[PDB]
Design a protein around this ligand. Structure first.
Ligand code: ADP
Ligand code: ADP
Ligand code: ADP
Ligand code: ADP
Ligand code: ADP
Ligand code: CRN
Ligand code: CRN
Ligand code: CRN
Ligand code: CRN
Ligand code: CRN
Ligand code: MG
Ligand code: MG
Ligand code: MG
Ligand code: MG
Ligand code: MG
Lengths: 368, 368, 368, 368, 368
């Protein structure tokens, strides 16, 4: 009968009295009640959006957004809650008002060769989603396999230095996977609290893989946390070369993907659409491992990092803790700035941190 | 969204831990859960069926059914709950298995003349509903006005001794209504707990009325608790004449109503459909007021009345209390027996009560 | 078939040729026809809105609105009929044009101490509804129980002077309920014509209760006529202290209710949404009992009360009559004025009344 | 809203207190209420079925059925009312139980030559409906034009003696139409009470016509009262030749119609479906005009005609009255008997009438 | 279940990596994804629109549009893809912005008499569609037969010189059809790649025909590639007479068609709606066969033709190749210019070609 009553929205309201994520900070009964009936065309709902944040009040060693997107329409359907979260997460960028700009030209990255005695590694990463296919939080098995096929067929066309091979996760022995992970190449096993709580570990390891070139300097993760993750690595401090290779490889990958009639999720308001709102815009993370000695001598690190808009994760893995003083330092914000700007910002911040190696002098300037 | 959850049926289950009506006795969580989604074509629901019983755990000075019907389909839609209630209320008659038979022949009711020193009044009543129109618990204003028009137009054709007039309740002064009520002719004001709790007092006194003959021995209540209530009264103990007049007048009224294309609610399983399950079948109540000085001398009355299947109400209605020793004693069951049988049963029971009035002897036989 | 015809709206139009309530005054065939198809999302309809007014043309000893709301959406869905009624009931306030403002500050209400020889009691009351739950006229059993649980859990957090206990109506003996009612604390039994006609007495006494502090100066009625009624009472003429306690207790109750994810029905156009349109806005009634020998000497009372915008009800109960010259005099209008303004208005009116009623002089100024 | 009530079926029940047609005889409130919601796939309803009977209580000089069909499905959808009417109209044939048989063989119809001094004309007629197209009572303009095109294209193939031409009613001058009607060839103007009341005169004379052979002994009415009416006429009493020509022409017409992918409405339970239930089965009417001076000498005619199952219409149509003693005497029943049987029955009845006509003796045997 | 996923639009995107038609040039993944859900009221879809272009990447000896329309609504529903195609196909005409104008006046077309030693034939053609009926790509058998009936009935009214006869394709022997085709009168057999791939050859030769006058100078193709194709032919270079006859015959045909209540597909934005977007606007093709000896001497022919906006097809048939040096040279664009303008343009271009024979001089001016 239509006379039966539904549970009022406040009855479903989550208990966030001890949570410490942006979703919990920006979620109110009014917003929840307003959005609790809406749904994206593929069936994504607000509860599925905020489940990861509800289940994870903490999650060291960083501040978590606590939300994910199930498809492209999510960011538009639930904008009333995503917009404040995006604005807070990206230090003031306002998706409602301003637009995002992207340029990939390493030529404007003049300089950018770190001290080889302090870095030991440099990486540049981005993510990409295929339009028309649900994101990992919501994708079914068929959609995930479709993403894998599209990406593999497109990547088969890479030639020259970028020429490489695809390795299916389900077809590689445990020893090979462990070796790849320990070498910082392959993505870790599905143990991240966000990955599990959001539902991105379903059907593991089906349809996940890694496509890498022979030198293993160019890599592409398929179906780990985004549809694709394009990575350029180098065991050194030559961020300039890493970024140049990353730019050319990304351009080639985009061209080959678009050749087959597939286009990437993208809108000028948000840039490139990805699952975590923290990866919107460029989705670019340019970072470096940093030397164990000397940087072990820092005391007021968090304030300096926050003022430089740099995020510090432990050694390999955001879910891990720094061992021996080695830190993965990268940019914090990815939306509102272009890739060249973000890479230059990372270079400047890391150079500032290096200059702050006061093993011979004293005093830190912080220098907001 | 379709992902929202409804209140489970047990959440709506009434609290009947102190109720004393047949609905409360025969209502169980399984039945409520099974029937809580169903609804009659006009929108009647189980909650509306059992509201009067839920709101009225007590209601002296009789045992109440605690249910009503909103339309003809109710008794079929919610039969899983009405059938046990009907069976218990009508001392074993099983609506599922057996059928109801009706005969209105005042020839086979020989005798039936009480002692004028003990009765002082004799009345015979029945009810009738117009098919296609909602019952008073659920009828809207338009439906009630339609019932009034149909009944008044049909009754305009009564001729001879039965010839009479219609008096609209909204058009009679308070003094006239009080005089009619105090004379036991007109129905009382809408104060009955069943009438109020079931919703039969909505829009009072709109479309309610009384059609009576000049001698006021033949009366018809329009829209009080059933669509029509046909009554034959006589200030005496001559039940034979009262029943003869009642039978002929009822036959004429039925003929005139059917002449215009309207038919009465009726099915051979239940007989004549009325709002209260206690009035099903014949819907016939034949009773007599009883002497004040004499029957005040009874002590074990309730057992004798129950064994004779006679119900005792106070003078001036069921909601009042007997004063001075005058009681309204009528038949208790109306379904499964024919009108002639019920009238003969009432006569036999009243004669037994008169015989038991032994102011000169002692000892009551009870005589189940 | 779709060729079947519906009863035209005028066929359902109520017969209000003798009614004396605002609904009857402002209801016209055009409005009824326009609104007779609409319905709130929960199924509330215009007929259910106006049933109480249709059934009750009179109801001394005050002028009745004759309408109720089944949920929050009602006031918006049937605004074409509620707006004129609200405007007339609240002496000119126009819900369409102007806005409502609320301030609960016991600082700006200086003075407010009556004469102990003329008052004997001072009370301040307000009502509150939980958003997302149907109002008492339309609420089901599950919704009523949900309201009770939310309110009881929230009120369990009151500490200090306000600390108190909840008493369930179904679990208190008749003697205790009678003692509480006779002491002016508990709400009366469900006999009010409005309460019965509107359908607010369904399932009584299930899920109704009273939460009061140890001193019984702070009380909260649960599910009588609104979802909650917050009351602060004191046997004396010290309205200042009563209002201060009322303000602080109300603020604490609102905070505790909102802590659990529930919010009160409220919109700046109408203020706080309640069942009766006469309680909209602040929903605040500040009143005092009156000494028996004294105000019994008044003769032109009604004009003075109307000019002061004060309502006069009998001793305890709007449905009762004044006995021994003891009157419950409170403010008449609740929407368009703030709580401080209403309390000051009540104080000024009562002080004027005390200044009037001259056993040593003669002549009443009326003083519009 | 779904809470609005519909007019109860008895409110729409027709007033048949003075009607004298089979529909009025066999229509009861129960049947009307049961069937008043049903409808054929094309939208035909019971009211449209019985409109002609409701509007025409009388209609001399015969007994009328008072019903029509809007399409093939009607006879199945409203069988609960058509079946008793068909049974009464066709002297006991039971559509529910027995089946209809058809044979068109002019070999087994030996004899059949009336007295040329008494007949002056012999005619044989049948009707046919095209399956998939609404009947004249319900057909739209497009459907009527489709019927006309199908019939004309099929009839263009008639060769030899049957070769003829189509004449469109809208393209023939009033003088030509009057001459054709007065010669008993063309159908009369749309003035029949049945034709007008049922709705078969809509858009007249659009898409109506007559296709006749050069000798005008073979004719086909298009869209007058059935989709097609096949007629074979002759002057004199040579019924055998008329029936032989009728049979061969009908067979050829059926073959040509079926060649184009169209089939006739037909089911073994009812035979050939036509608008009026009186034309079901064979739909065959074989009749003769009869002598003016002579049969004017009959006195007990109606009983003899009824006992012979012969119907007597006036000359120049059913709606006219016999002039000068000339009568159109044909078979009364068309369903349950085969065409050969019906023609033989007509011959036997007319021969009996001739034998009883001779006034040289006295006494009529009636001879049921 | 609603949780099942659909193939993403890019999965259905056609593979056009080697196609050479305007649809392939102007089709992009974004447009396909945007339009792949839409559909005209009759069920036409984008895939059905572009099937012919997808299946035919080449098709000498001209540039093909690669699209067709299934009904009138197509050009509006899929305008996002048809508009750029129309603009490119009609040398800059913008359907979104500008409007189309039509005038058929053979008075303002003075001159127009070619050299009889170079032409040997002149023809003027247009197409017309009946509003409310699906176009040949999507029309069912019933719709095609309806078009045939409407056109034949209308054309039966042609009188005088234009008087002619209809010849049904299914009723003419192979020899007659071959003779008509070889004489350049009848349309070729259904072998055109566009006709087959678009679905215009379904049910061949049902409901196709040719209506021509006795002199065979005025012809009308029924149901070949448009609903109607009106043609005026004449051996020789007297284009003025051909165009005059064409104009008067077209006006008469339009009048006769409109007399019966049928109107032609037409809107001022696009002109006359036809299946191929290359025939929009006037739908007019005025052309001439050209001399074999002399025009065989052309060397830079294609550039001259393109600059003159003239299209060159082989001898009879767009799908055939020029034999012996005889070419069918007509106007290329049909939308944005009026019929008189197009005919004058054709005359000027053909005269320029004649003057460029240069059998006695040297040098071609091209003369854009
Ligand atoms: N500067 C770096 N040098 C080498 N490896 C890195 C660097 N930054 C990240 N990685 C590798 O990336 C993997 C996953 O890191 P994660 O915190 O998930 O980064 P992301 O945000 O790109 O997922 C780790 O196994 C780590 O070894
Ligand atoms: N035997 C009787 N004699 C006189 N009046 C009677 C008798 N029985 C019932 N009544 C009258 O009928 C009225 C209503 O009685 P009630 O118990 O409601 O009857 P019902 O069973 O028809 O509802 C009362 O005012 C009462 O006086
Ligand atoms: N000034 C007062 N002093 C003591 N009790 C009061 C006062 N005003 C109202 N009450 C109590 O409130 C109860 C209900 O009063 P009612 O007319 O319903 O007011 P409300 O409009 O708040 O419901 C009564 O039982 C009465 O005793
Ligand atoms: N035996 C006959 N001879 C000549 N004409 C006849 C004969 N029977 C019928 N008709 C003609 O048929 C026409 C219509 O008759 P009608 O009663 O409508 O027959 P039907 O019921 O078959 O339509 C009349 O004009 C009448 O002249
Ligand atoms: N100038 C012309 N003279 C004679 N016949 C022509 C001429 N132009 C076209 N045709 C005839 O038209 C027929 C079909 O030509 P087609 O290329 O389909 O033109 P359209 O675009 O009008 O269909 C051919 O059989 C051809 O003989
Ligand atoms: C650790 N997280 C969550 C976040 O960035 O807030 C990732 N999206 N990787
Ligand atoms: C008193 N009652 C209730 C009952 O019979 O149970 C009436 N239906 N009158
Ligand atoms: C007495 N009433 C009715 C009214 O205020 O009109 C209450 N709502 N309490
Ligand atoms: C006269 N009628 C009606 C009837 O047969 O009842 C015709 N159907 N022709
Ligand atoms: C040859 N074609 C295709 C085209 O014009 O592109 C025809 N529509 N005739
Ligand atoms: Mg990661
Ligand atoms: Mg009663
Ligand atoms: Mg109250
Ligand atoms: Mg006829
Ligand atoms: Mg062609």
């Amino acid at each position: 009968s239509e006379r039966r009553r539904l549970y009022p929205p406040s009855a479903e309201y989550p208990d966030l009295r001890k949570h410490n994520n942006c979703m919990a900070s920006h979620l109110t009964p009014a917003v929840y009640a307003r959005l609790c009936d809406k749904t994206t065309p593929t069936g994504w709902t607000l509860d599925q959006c905020i489940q990861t944040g509800v289940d994870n009040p903490g999650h060291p060693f960083i501040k978590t957004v606590g939300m994910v997107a199930g498809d492209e329409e999510t960011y538009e359907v639930f904008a009333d809650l995503f917009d404040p979260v995006i604005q807070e997460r990206h230090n003031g960028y306002d998706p409602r008002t301003m637009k995002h700009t992207t340029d990939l030209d390493a030529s404007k990255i003049r300089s950018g060769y770190f001290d080889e005695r302090y870095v030991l590694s440099s990486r540049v990463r981005t993510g990409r989603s295929i339009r028309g296919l649900s994101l990992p939080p919501a994708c079914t098995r068929a959609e995930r396999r479709e993403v894998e096929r599209v990406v593999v067929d497109a990547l088969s066309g890479l030639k020259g230095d970028l020429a490489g091979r695809y390795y299916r996760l389900s077809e590689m022995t445990e020893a090979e996977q462990q070796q790849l992970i320990d070498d910082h190449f392959l993505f870790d096993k599905p143990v991240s609290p966000l990955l599990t709580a959001a539902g991105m570990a379903r059907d593991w390891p089906d349809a996940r893989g890694i496509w890498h070139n022979n030198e293993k300097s160019f890599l592409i993760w398929v179906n780990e946390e985004d549809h694709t993750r394009v990575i350029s690595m180098e065991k050194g401090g030559n961020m300039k070369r890493v970024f140049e290779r990353f730019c050319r490889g990304l351009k080639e990958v985009e061209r080959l993907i678009q050749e087959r009639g597939w286009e990437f999720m993208w809108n000028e308001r948000l840039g490139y659409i990805l699952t975590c709102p923290s990866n919107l815009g460029t989705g670019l993370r340019a970072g470096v491992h940093i030397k164990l000695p000397l940087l072990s001598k820092d005391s007021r690190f968090p304030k300096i990092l926050e003022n430089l808009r740099l995020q510090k994760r432990g050694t390999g893995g955001v879910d891990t803790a720094a061992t021996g003083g080695v830190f993965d330092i990268s940019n914090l914000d990815r939306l509102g700035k272009s890739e060249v700007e973000l890479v230059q910002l990372v270079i400047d911040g890391v150079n500032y941190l290096i200059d702050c190696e006061r093993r011979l002098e004293r005093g830190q300037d912080i220098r907001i």
